[PDB]
Every structure is written in C-alpha cells, then in structure tokens.
Amino acid sequence: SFVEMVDNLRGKSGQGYYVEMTVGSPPQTLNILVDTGSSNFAVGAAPHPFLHRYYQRQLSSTYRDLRKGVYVPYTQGKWEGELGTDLVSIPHGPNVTVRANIAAITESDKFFINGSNWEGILGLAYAEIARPDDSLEPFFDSLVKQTHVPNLFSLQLCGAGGSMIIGGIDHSLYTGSLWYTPIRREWYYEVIIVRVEINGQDLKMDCKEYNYDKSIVDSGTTNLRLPKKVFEAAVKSIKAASSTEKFPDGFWLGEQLVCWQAGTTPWNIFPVISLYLMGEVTNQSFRITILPQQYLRPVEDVATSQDDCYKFAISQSSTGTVMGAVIMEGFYVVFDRARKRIGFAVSACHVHDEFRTAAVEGPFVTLDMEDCGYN
C-alpha cells in the first residue's frame, strides 16, 4: 500500500536521499542511495572507513557469483566490484522480494561519503547506460518482470526526507495538476527544456542550447547543472538581481559559504528560475519554477549554526543540463516508464515564503516549431 511507503526516504540534497533495502538470505539491511541518474545496483561489500556496515556474501545462502567484474566511473567518484545475483527487498516499499543483479563493491574512490548513512546505490535509469553494458538488467526492470507491479515509480524529495512510491501515483503527495513531459530517449531520464526565464525574463537562446548535449533528471546529484552558455547567462541574471548584497570570493563557483544572521536571509533579492518543459502536445509546454530556497542550499554545520549559511547550488556542466536534487525538491515527480513520460506536480513539502512559491503551471504555447532536442 502506498500509505505504507510514505516517508520511506531520509537524507539531504547535498549527501543524497536513501531508502532501506535488504540483500541476501537471511536479509541483510542496508541504506541505499536513490539514483535516477544511473542504472547499476551496487553495495559496499568490503570494509571501508566510511561504511557503517556492508554486504557479506558469505553469509547469504542465496548468493550466486557471476564470476565477472564491473567498473563504474561517475562524474565524481568510482567503484569496482564483482557481479552476482541475490534476493533483494524494500521493507518500506512494495511487498515483494526479487532476484536482482548486485555489484559487490570491493574497491572505491570518492564514492562513499563520510557520514552520509548509505552503503550502496540504486540506479533506476535504463539498461542502455548500465555497466559493463546493456545486458546487465537493472533492478527496476527485474522488479517489474518478476512481480508485475506497474512500471512506474514516483519521488517526493523534501528539504529541511521524502517518499519513493513504487507502482502507482499517491495523490496524497501532491496538490494541483500533474504535468507530463516526454522521455526523449530511454537511457538516462532525458527530457527537453524549451524555454528558460529568470525572474520572468526570457534568456532568449536557441532552445537547443538548453539541452546541449542532453538534459536529464538526476536524483543522484545535488545541483542544477547547466551548459556553459546557459550557466553564464543564469549567473549574470542572479548577480544583477542580488547586487544590493556583497558575496564572497568564489560564491558563484559553488564551493564558498555565504551566511546571514539567523532568519534574515534576503530571499527577495534572488530571482525565481522557470524551466519550461516540452509538453505531450505539439508546441505546448509547462513550467516548473525554482525559488532561491531551492538553489541556495543550506549547509548544516554545528560550527556555523549561530547563522544561516548556504552554498550556490547551480553549477556549470560538461555533461549537459542536470536537474538534480535541489530541482526535484518540493515537487512530486512521477517516472512513468510505462507511458515514457515524467510528471511534475507541487508536493506537500514544496518551498515557499509569504510572497512566492514553487509552482507547476501550464499550458504555454510556442509559435516557433523548432525541435529543441540536440540530437
């Protein structure tokens, strides 16, 4: 039941959102990062300084060794491991147990994060980007094949963890309309952005620039990441709007804190960002609007806690546009694999203050018939 799956996530955008799973027989409990930006299921399987616990294959009588190895390099971080299959369950997810491929991580570099509280990663994207290749069936595909749960899941990520609902839409988790954008290609969850405004002002670029060389929805990474041209235009606009404030050296590079007296953050001087996504009907679109409460990410540190401090959670990308966790936060996001579309709606934990609120609005119509896809 969906009600049983509600509030089954913990974590933050900066260190990720994770769900409890078990592997092996008897079941071994682990916390697992929910990642729509990759397609491998992998768990720590050997001691590591940052791991509270790990998968012990010798203690699972249902483990089968595939006698093959696998290596996954992400944008930052990588691991190597041994492939096998075993029984996998989600205690606070669907009421089923399935046999799935598992990469047992034996070596890693900058993959595990000190204090994150997760020990593995659940790649929910498509087989096309699985390593070593597309013949390694991803977890969700196995789940659907073996249980015939409906082929979709939804994510409600919340800031200061959320819910992952498998098998159908929980209307309790959103208000207003659910708007759908087509999945352009089933590899990453690739989508098309047709227009970008910052505080109502159109960036006026050829819309293919917004999707150079792809745009994806990626719960596994923290920031909104933009292609250089779009990134520079966005920073220009946000800097202009907030000019009454002085920001530290390096703030706009995203790795320097800015702080304000507790409760005095000047939200109003930062603009809203509107991303218009391709609609299901030709040249119609809808927008999701992103507040500074989203793209200024709070950094929790007891040492700085006399004040409220933030990092700038928009980054220049070399891999195309990435709608990461700070973008997904506050929205109910439906990964409707069965109908090859992703839906957005305002969720119960959407960001807002007394003047402005995150929103999902449409339809909008566009005159120019250009295809905004880059490939």
Ligand SMILES: CC(C)(C)c1cccc(CN[C@H]2CS(=O)(=O)C[C@@H](Cc3cc(F)c(N)c(C[C@H](O)C(F)(F)F)c3)[C@@H]2O)c1
């Ligand atoms: C298909 C594949 C080859 C896997 C590939 C290669 C490059 C980029 C991508 C796109 N998705 C990527 C984007 S990323 O590298 O920023 C995060 C990874 C998953 C990931 C790997 C890691 F180490 C670590 N710490 C984390 C934790 C995150 O940093 C946090 F903390 F959640 F924000 C997450 C995504 O999956 C996919």
